[PDB]
Amino acid sequence: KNIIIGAMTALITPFKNGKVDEQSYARLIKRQIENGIDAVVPVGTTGESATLTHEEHRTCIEIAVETCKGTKVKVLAGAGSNATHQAVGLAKFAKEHGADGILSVAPYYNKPTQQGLYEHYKAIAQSVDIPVLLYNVPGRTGCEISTDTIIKLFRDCENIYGVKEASGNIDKCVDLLAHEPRMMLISGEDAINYPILSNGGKGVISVTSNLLPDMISALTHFALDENYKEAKKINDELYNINKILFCESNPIPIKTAMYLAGLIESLEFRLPLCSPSKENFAKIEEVMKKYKIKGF
Amino acid sequence: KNIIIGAMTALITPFKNGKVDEQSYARLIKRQIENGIDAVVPVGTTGESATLTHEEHRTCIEIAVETCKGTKVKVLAGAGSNATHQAVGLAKFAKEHGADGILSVAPYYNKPTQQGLYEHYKAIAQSVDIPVLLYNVPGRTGCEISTDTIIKLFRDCENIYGVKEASGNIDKCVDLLAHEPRMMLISGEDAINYPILSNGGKGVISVTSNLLPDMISALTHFALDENYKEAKKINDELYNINKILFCESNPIPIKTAMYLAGLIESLEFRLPLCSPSKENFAKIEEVMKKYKIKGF
Ligand SMILES: [Mg+2]
Ligand SMILES: [Mg+2]
């Protein structure tokens, strides 16, 4: 199977006067590339996919593809939906614009059954010839892709090569790799990057790497090199920032941190996302003090 | 405040050879009208909003509006989104196509904060001059509209007149009406229609009423008249069907029941929704046998 693994960043989408700051977006991606990141994820959850237009999805994906040209960094495009017809179109769309693979979130809100999830992802995988990474995040979607369903999709569909897990369930991560060790388990929860990697996970799709790409990259590469002692020490050091970045719903804290670090111009979201409370703003600033934040 | 209350139906959307069966849709709404229902909700969750195109949304709302002309039955159009800009557009869209009000679900998947939810619904309510009913269903959205947020929205915005609760939380239903008795609490969970109404709830937005409109309507109107013994009797008798209609994710069981009753021609969903298991199909068939199902 063709795979996209390693240290990956769920890119924030900066806004300036209510529009995509395209120059900021490119600068942020180059900052990721220059700090050891192996792939970038445009217009995922951290990138506020929900509130971007289709045109803007296209724009952010094209900017990611363009900025990654001439480097080894791949573009794993966010392209998923709770409507299978739309998911299929978004996958073809992402491939069409130069993405190396797609990250496809489990249908949110309409709670499909396991059978429906299987047919959903089979249609997506059959629509393109590039790698497809499942994304399970039940706290957001209201549904869970079961281990059996993930393993069936991995075995039955050639493009599906693994899953990004954001489920706080290391038991399931054991379940997945004990029964299907060939799949690529990808950490979608920064605080437990190391436990997932030390169990045979092969990458992270990170929120924290927006702010601290060098640290997340080093952690992932240490672990992939089976230097678990060094990977754990970064994971432990990152715990405080990893947790405070979810004091409010992601990406509210990470954008707050990027703004506080001077990495993005304005602390702008699209409704229904908004600035944090005064209190959480201060907590984020407080936690950041112990970390060294690379500039441009 | 202008309100839309009473016995209301979350309309299923019948498909025929992959497209909306427009004839069937109008026929189903006429059947609701003729069995005492006070309002219909086109293109909600039960109507598979997520997998309908914009054009199909227009179409279903127009059929509902047209079918309810010359009757007292109101159209509370499904018009919500997890992007505030889009939810505002859908609200204006529904009003301009003749809807009497809108049902607007809490943003799913991106989990806005309470502050963000307030700004979200404030923007929606300020964009139209027709009643707006909030819809709280945390099992599907991953977020909760808190009692304080609901009450603030009710007090600050003219059009917001209450909330449809699908939260299994009668404590919250007490909290809401004890602190703000002027709001319209609407049951969004058929099994507990009577407890919500007996605490001062003023209507239901029902799944079961698709199949048994006369019984749900009678239950509601008994309760609104404080004939609680008669309303409780129907609620108790309805428990078995109210529960089996969620053996799989709504609207999979209700569409199955409508098909088994001969009320729709095809057991068709749009992916990622799909037919129920063989076993769940049979269980739905058994439970329906206790109930007397009105024809056309
Ligand atoms: Mg009317
Ligand atoms: Mg009376």
XYZ file of C-alpha atoms and ligand atoms in Angstrom:
594
model
C 0.000 0.000 0.000
C 1.017 3.588 -0.674
C 1.124 5.388 2.672
C 1.586 8.859 4.121
C 3.053 8.634 7.633
C 5.475 10.430 9.951
C 5.136 13.837 11.573
C 2.170 15.734 10.119
C 0.523 19.057 10.914
C -3.202 19.831 10.898
C -2.716 23.335 9.507
C -4.553 26.280 10.988
C -6.148 28.611 8.446
C -5.307 32.259 9.243
C -7.852 34.918 8.411
C -7.298 38.609 7.733
C -10.305 40.840 7.454
C -12.596 37.819 7.215
C -10.652 36.230 4.341
C -8.024 33.523 4.010
C -4.619 35.125 4.549
C -2.971 33.338 1.642
C 0.491 34.801 2.264
C 0.333 33.838 5.938
C -0.846 30.350 4.972
C 2.149 29.782 2.685
C 4.586 31.225 5.243
C 3.197 28.917 7.937
C 3.582 25.875 5.691
C 7.190 26.759 4.859
C 7.793 27.066 8.603
C 6.452 23.520 9.021
C 8.607 22.208 6.162
C 11.751 23.801 7.591
C 11.173 22.230 11.027
C 11.195 18.576 9.983
C 7.508 17.972 9.232
C 6.804 15.071 6.865
C 3.312 16.051 5.661
C 0.770 18.838 6.083
C -3.009 18.539 6.366
C -4.797 21.517 4.790
C -8.446 22.281 5.610
C -8.963 19.705 8.318
C -10.725 20.360 11.603
C -7.824 22.468 12.895
C -8.063 24.419 9.636
C -11.762 25.234 10.195
C -12.896 23.162 7.195
C -16.516 23.608 8.322
C -16.542 27.388 7.744
C -14.514 27.573 4.508
C -16.078 27.742 1.054
C -15.297 25.238 -1.576
C -13.224 27.799 -3.366
C -11.219 28.417 -0.209
C -10.741 24.649 0.304
C -9.298 24.622 -3.200
C -7.151 27.633 -2.453
C -5.667 26.216 0.738
C -5.052 22.838 -0.901
C -3.376 24.469 -3.903
C -1.217 26.617 -1.619
C -0.187 23.512 0.329
C 0.617 21.623 -2.879
C 2.559 24.585 -4.272
C 4.539 25.216 -1.078
C 5.494 21.558 -0.788
C 6.806 21.313 -4.316
C 10.459 20.543 -4.506
C 10.463 19.068 -1.001
C 9.768 15.637 0.472
C 6.769 16.990 2.401
C 3.451 15.555 1.240
C -0.018 17.104 1.252
C -2.652 14.996 3.033
C -5.759 16.975 2.141
C -8.743 17.165 4.436
C -11.609 15.880 2.319
C -14.520 14.333 4.057
C -18.184 14.826 4.624
C -21.263 13.376 6.221
C -22.767 12.951 2.728
C -21.093 10.178 0.761
C -21.758 11.868 -2.579
C -20.087 14.931 -1.330
C -17.232 12.949 0.197
C -16.587 11.276 -3.119
C -16.534 14.635 -4.902
C -14.215 16.170 -2.306
C -11.803 13.237 -2.678
C -11.690 13.572 -6.472
C -11.387 17.338 -5.965
C -8.393 16.942 -3.633
C -6.606 14.489 -5.924
C -7.282 16.860 -8.842
C -5.497 19.665 -7.107
C -2.253 17.764 -6.400
C -2.872 16.296 -2.954
C -0.784 13.194 -2.248
C -3.568 11.641 -0.168
C -6.764 12.491 1.658
C -7.806 12.501 5.297
C -11.519 11.612 5.412
C -13.407 12.204 8.657
C -16.144 9.817 9.739
C -19.613 11.216 8.910
C -20.610 13.639 11.644
C -24.115 14.274 13.003
C -26.117 11.731 10.964
C -24.627 8.745 12.853
C -24.338 6.068 10.139
C -24.201 2.425 11.136
C -21.040 0.375 10.705
C -22.429 -0.993 7.435
C -23.050 2.557 6.234
C -19.557 3.639 7.273
C -18.104 0.736 5.275
C -20.056 1.667 2.141
C -19.199 5.349 2.691
C -15.444 4.790 2.754
C -15.504 2.134 0.024
C -17.113 4.658 -2.318
C -14.497 7.266 -1.396
C -11.586 4.853 -1.835
C -12.891 3.639 -5.194
C -13.155 7.240 -6.437
C -9.415 8.055 -6.373
C -6.057 6.318 -6.759
C -4.257 8.073 -3.888
C -3.947 6.988 -0.242
C -6.958 7.481 2.025
C -6.559 7.855 5.792
C -9.668 7.321 7.892
C -10.292 9.816 10.698
C -12.147 8.629 13.816
C -13.073 11.357 16.316
C -16.292 10.232 18.045
C -16.429 13.163 20.460
C -16.982 15.409 17.434
C -18.855 13.167 14.998
C -21.208 11.312 17.339
C -20.209 8.006 15.734
C -17.326 5.546 16.052
C -15.645 3.557 13.295
C -15.279 0.183 14.985
C -12.029 -1.762 14.850
C -13.686 -4.433 12.684
C -14.892 -1.780 10.235
C -11.480 -0.099 10.016
C -9.765 -3.454 9.472
C -12.282 -4.537 6.817
C -11.813 -1.253 4.946
C -8.023 -1.574 5.153
C -8.136 -5.136 3.805
C -10.889 -4.642 1.219
C -9.844 -1.285 -0.272
C -6.374 -0.655 -1.613
C -6.205 3.081 -1.041
C -7.229 2.875 2.632
C -3.989 2.421 4.569
C -4.828 3.300 8.177
C -6.675 5.562 10.578
C -6.119 8.808 12.457
C -7.449 8.117 15.957
C -8.684 10.933 18.190
C -10.611 8.788 20.663
C -8.683 8.709 23.966
C -8.749 4.913 23.760
C -5.349 3.224 23.868
C -7.192 -0.108 24.243
C -8.597 0.378 20.742
C -5.113 1.285 19.500
C -3.909 -2.069 20.822
C -6.991 -3.712 19.308
C -6.266 -2.233 15.870
C -2.573 -3.110 15.635
C -2.866 -6.504 17.347
C -5.380 -7.719 14.760
C -4.084 -5.763 11.730
C -0.403 -4.899 12.249
C -0.008 -3.801 8.598
C -2.172 -0.689 8.972
C -0.834 2.794 9.743
C -2.213 3.997 13.067
C -1.853 7.779 13.258
C -2.143 9.713 16.516
C -4.781 12.425 16.403
C -4.335 13.415 20.066
C -1.087 15.234 20.837
C -0.926 14.408 24.553
C -0.716 10.678 23.780
C 1.468 10.843 20.659
C 4.189 8.759 22.299
C 1.965 5.936 23.670
C 0.365 5.541 20.247
C 3.756 5.580 18.497
C 5.347 3.231 21.048
C 2.602 0.686 20.286
C 3.528 0.701 16.594
C 1.698 3.788 15.386
C 3.546 5.327 12.455
C 2.758 9.021 12.689
C 0.888 11.923 14.204
C -1.454 14.494 12.728
C -0.766 17.241 15.187
C -2.299 20.420 16.529
C 0.701 21.283 18.701
C 3.090 21.133 15.730
C 1.522 24.376 14.455
C 3.258 26.121 17.365
C 6.139 23.700 18.064
C 6.834 21.848 14.792
C 10.453 21.020 15.662
C 9.439 19.316 18.912
C 6.624 17.235 17.396
C 8.838 16.282 14.445
C 11.705 15.205 16.711
C 9.339 13.210 18.939
C 7.876 11.370 15.950
C 11.240 10.660 14.323
C 12.801 9.465 17.589
C 9.893 7.048 17.999
C 10.030 5.853 14.385
C 13.770 5.317 14.924
C 12.839 3.225 17.990
C 14.474 5.790 20.282
C 11.522 5.550 22.637
C 13.382 7.091 25.574
C 14.000 10.316 23.650
C 10.504 10.363 22.163
C 8.935 9.989 25.612
C 10.980 12.856 27.053
C 9.607 15.242 24.403
C 6.093 13.849 24.898
C 6.350 14.442 28.653
C 7.754 17.935 28.149
C 4.925 18.738 25.724
C 2.114 17.553 28.023
C 1.302 20.987 29.462
C 1.031 22.705 26.077
C -0.648 19.637 24.565
C -3.415 19.891 27.178
C -3.889 23.665 27.289
C -4.347 23.648 23.516
C -7.727 22.003 24.185
C -8.843 24.143 27.161
C -11.390 25.308 24.579
C -12.436 23.531 21.392
C -9.625 23.142 18.902
C -8.620 25.279 17.006
C -9.514 28.155 19.395
C -6.467 27.644 21.683
C -3.933 26.911 18.926
C -4.899 30.039 16.985
C -4.689 31.971 20.249
C -1.186 30.550 20.775
C -0.107 31.271 17.186
C -1.318 34.847 17.616
C 0.405 35.211 20.996
C 3.652 33.908 19.478
C 3.398 36.461 16.663
C 3.066 33.729 14.027
C -0.287 34.929 12.661
C -1.454 38.505 12.285
C -4.852 38.468 13.868
C -6.787 36.320 16.229
C -9.687 35.812 13.805
C -12.097 32.874 13.540
C -15.255 32.258 11.541
C -18.434 31.900 13.547
C -19.519 29.799 15.372
C -15.862 29.725 16.448
C -14.702 32.744 18.429
C -11.986 34.085 20.723
C -11.425 32.327 24.085
C -12.454 33.654 27.403
C -10.183 36.097 29.085
C -9.223 33.386 31.481
C -8.268 30.748 28.905
C -6.406 33.366 26.874
C -4.298 34.007 29.974
C -3.855 30.286 30.676
C -2.581 29.682 27.135
C -0.110 32.560 27.442
C 1.024 31.223 30.821
C 1.647 27.662 29.584
C 3.578 28.884 26.523
C 6.275 30.484 28.692
C 8.120 27.222 29.319
C 8.410 26.393 25.598
C 10.692 27.710 22.879
C 8.640 28.683 19.848
C 10.485 28.755 16.533
C 9.985 31.889 14.467
C 10.077 32.246 10.708
C -43.345 36.357 20.719
C -44.552 34.536 17.608
C -44.422 30.798 18.264
C -44.926 27.514 16.438
C -45.974 24.822 18.921
C -48.216 21.783 19.266
C -47.858 18.394 17.612
C -45.145 18.536 14.935
C -43.550 15.984 12.601
C -39.928 15.725 11.455
C -40.809 14.631 7.919
C -38.965 11.738 6.327
C -37.749 12.393 2.781
C -38.747 9.508 0.482
C -36.381 8.727 -2.369
C -37.306 7.077 -5.643
C -34.535 5.927 -7.991
C -32.036 8.165 -6.217
C -34.143 11.354 -6.328
C -36.678 12.940 -3.987
C -40.109 11.381 -4.610
C -41.987 14.662 -4.775
C -45.389 13.080 -5.145
C -44.857 10.860 -2.174
C -43.540 13.835 -0.175
C -46.683 15.908 -0.761
C -48.865 12.856 -0.064
C -47.090 12.225 3.243
C -47.614 15.836 4.317
C -51.319 15.715 3.398
C -51.542 12.585 5.564
C -49.967 14.467 8.498
C -52.365 17.409 8.050
C -55.372 15.093 8.002
C -54.356 13.394 11.268
C -54.260 16.456 13.512
C -50.608 17.510 13.205
C -50.020 21.217 13.854
C -46.725 21.731 12.022
C -44.330 19.844 9.783
C -40.542 20.085 9.730
C -39.173 19.571 6.214
C -35.477 18.805 5.700
C -34.522 18.126 9.295
C -32.431 15.260 10.616
C -35.278 12.792 10.090
C -35.534 14.139 6.534
C -31.826 13.423 5.850
C -30.912 17.105 5.344
C -27.208 16.185 5.282
C -27.512 14.209 2.022
C -29.945 16.503 0.183
C -28.649 19.082 -2.274
C -29.494 22.763 -1.917
C -31.967 22.405 -4.721
C -33.632 19.416 -3.000
C -33.814 21.468 0.133
C -35.620 24.217 -1.798
C -37.900 21.716 -3.346
C -38.940 20.019 -0.099
C -39.602 23.324 1.675
C -41.681 24.562 -1.261
C -43.734 21.354 -1.298
C -44.329 21.668 2.451
C -45.348 25.334 2.145
C -47.607 24.618 -0.830
C -49.237 21.586 0.792
C -49.917 23.546 4.016
C -51.596 26.548 2.331
C -55.249 26.919 3.238
C -54.694 24.912 6.375
C -53.676 25.883 9.806
C -50.566 23.719 9.575
C -47.283 25.567 9.808
C -43.958 24.822 8.162
C -41.028 24.870 10.581
C -38.256 24.409 8.051
C -35.010 22.723 8.949
C -32.401 25.438 8.453
C -29.218 24.958 10.446
C -25.528 24.527 9.815
C -22.244 24.392 11.683
C -21.091 27.446 9.695
C -22.816 30.613 10.884
C -22.614 32.311 7.479
C -24.346 29.306 5.910
C -26.926 28.984 8.702
C -27.860 32.638 8.132
C -28.221 31.985 4.406
C -30.384 28.921 5.028
C -32.591 30.900 7.433
C -33.157 33.680 4.882
C -33.629 30.994 2.237
C -36.354 29.255 4.249
C -38.208 32.487 5.030
C -38.114 33.707 1.442
C -39.572 30.366 0.288
C -42.584 30.706 2.601
C -41.601 28.849 5.784
C -43.468 29.954 8.904
C -40.376 29.437 11.070
C -37.059 27.640 11.213
C -35.594 24.836 13.290
C -31.844 25.466 13.537
C -29.664 22.717 15.012
C -26.702 23.516 17.247
C -23.441 23.498 15.214
C -22.280 19.918 14.790
C -18.677 18.650 14.716
C -16.774 21.910 15.300
C -17.988 22.284 18.935
C -18.364 26.059 19.407
C -18.199 27.463 22.908
C -21.259 28.879 24.655
C -20.129 32.346 23.583
C -19.850 31.123 19.992
C -23.274 29.468 20.137
C -24.774 32.738 21.370
C -23.204 34.734 18.531
C -24.195 31.993 16.070
C -27.886 32.046 16.962
C -27.950 35.815 17.439
C -26.761 36.232 13.838
C -29.364 33.760 12.563
C -32.210 35.368 14.502
C -31.249 38.871 13.371
C -31.330 37.781 9.701
C -35.058 36.888 9.536
C -38.384 38.039 10.983
C -39.939 34.596 11.532
C -39.760 32.426 14.669
C -36.550 30.490 15.324
C -36.543 27.297 17.390
C -33.172 26.133 18.680
C -32.426 22.412 18.447
C -30.177 20.813 21.086
C -29.078 17.244 20.375
C -25.599 16.717 21.899
C -25.396 13.023 21.000
C -25.326 14.115 17.348
C -23.555 17.507 17.488
C -20.899 16.922 20.126
C -21.885 20.193 21.822
C -24.582 21.343 24.242
C -26.517 24.600 24.273
C -26.477 25.293 27.997
C -29.585 26.409 29.849
C -27.994 29.825 30.438
C -27.203 30.190 26.729
C -30.720 29.133 25.693
C -32.267 31.551 28.179
C -30.026 34.439 27.088
C -30.917 33.851 23.437
C -34.626 33.710 24.292
C -34.416 36.997 26.193
C -32.089 38.860 23.793
C -33.635 37.914 20.419
C -37.169 38.447 19.403
C -37.486 35.450 17.089
C -35.951 32.780 19.304
C -38.955 31.435 21.193
C -37.772 28.118 22.640
C -35.753 24.963 22.138
C -36.292 21.451 20.825
C -34.485 19.199 23.317
C -33.155 15.771 22.331
C -30.898 15.293 25.346
C -32.446 12.650 27.648
C -32.200 15.222 30.421
C -35.450 15.993 32.244
C -33.376 17.830 34.873
C -32.411 20.318 32.161
C -36.057 20.580 31.132
C -36.909 21.595 34.702
C -33.968 24.012 34.789
C -35.118 25.663 31.554
C -38.759 26.219 32.494
C -38.137 26.978 36.181
C -35.891 29.918 35.294
C -37.609 30.996 32.040
C -41.225 29.754 31.980
C -42.095 31.909 28.938
C -40.070 29.808 26.496
C -41.538 26.999 24.391
C -39.863 23.729 25.337
C -40.393 21.205 22.538
C -39.817 17.493 23.000
C -37.385 16.067 20.484
C -37.441 12.567 22.020
C -40.653 10.647 21.377
C -40.342 8.254 24.317
C -40.447 11.147 26.802
C -43.002 13.336 25.030
C -45.368 13.170 28.002
C -42.848 14.002 30.787
C -41.666 17.068 28.870
C -45.221 18.243 28.152
C -46.374 17.587 31.720
C -43.567 19.873 32.950
C -44.884 22.724 30.792
C -43.456 21.774 27.418
C -45.713 23.081 24.671
C -45.130 20.709 21.768
C -43.246 17.836 20.185
C -41.177 17.487 17.042
C -41.736 13.795 16.584
C -40.271 10.916 14.606
C -43.045 8.474 15.519
C -45.722 10.836 14.162
C -44.513 9.997 10.636
C -46.038 6.540 11.191
C -48.663 7.321 13.863
C -49.619 10.991 13.391
C -53.055 10.621 14.997
C -51.632 9.122 18.196
C -48.850 11.681 18.635
C -51.264 14.529 17.896
C -53.809 13.204 20.400
C -51.073 12.760 23.030
C -49.933 16.365 22.594
C -53.384 17.956 22.637
C -54.516 15.950 25.654
C -51.389 17.190 27.438
C -51.843 20.812 26.343
C -55.359 20.614 27.828
C -53.860 19.177 31.054
C -55.647 15.879 30.394
C -52.520 14.213 31.699
C -54.050 10.791 32.352
C -55.025 10.481 28.688
C -51.740 11.901 27.410
C -49.732 9.565 29.653
C -51.782 6.584 28.453
C -50.810 7.207 24.821
C -47.186 7.922 25.767
C -47.052 4.626 27.671
C -48.705 2.674 24.849
C -46.286 4.277 22.377
C -43.138 3.396 24.333
C -42.394 0.173 22.433
C -42.594 1.779 18.984
C -40.905 4.960 20.241
C -37.934 2.827 21.313
C -37.698 0.469 18.343
C -37.662 3.501 16.039
C -34.125 4.135 17.340
C -32.819 0.543 17.310
C -30.624 2.029 14.567
C -29.870 5.698 13.941
C -32.915 7.747 13.028
C -34.244 7.881 10.316
C -33.228 4.289 9.434
C -35.990 2.637 11.531
C -38.766 5.136 10.713
C -38.144 4.859 6.968
C -38.175 1.080 7.434
C -41.520 1.331 9.242
C -42.999 3.661 6.612
C -41.943 1.207 3.904
C -43.351 -1.775 5.821
C -46.641 0.107 6.268
C -46.817 0.736 2.519
C -46.613 4.495 3.075
C -43.505 4.910 0.890
C -42.616 2.923 -2.200
C -38.890 2.307 -1.689
C -36.658 1.647 1.322
C -34.018 4.011 -0.063
C -31.530 6.133 1.870
C -28.571 8.197 0.762
C -25.186 7.022 1.945
C -23.823 7.003 4.550
C -27.304 5.941 5.690
C -28.368 2.455 4.622
C -30.975 -0.220 5.220
C -31.158 -1.748 8.728
C -29.848 -5.185 9.614
C -32.147 -8.099 8.731
C -32.819 -8.596 12.375
C -33.590 -4.976 13.120
C -35.888 -4.984 10.075
C -37.777 -7.925 11.590
C -37.928 -6.334 15.057
C -39.435 -3.159 13.604
C -41.954 -5.362 11.777
C -42.993 -7.055 14.922
C -43.510 -3.879 16.994
C -45.600 -2.199 14.320
C -48.167 -4.992 14.667
C -49.433 -3.549 17.973
C -50.243 -0.221 16.487
C -53.030 0.831 14.259
C -51.401 2.704 11.388
C -53.479 5.241 9.481
C -53.402 4.985 5.700
C -53.836 7.777 3.191
Mg -49.828 27.808 6.834
Mg -59.504 20.882 24.092
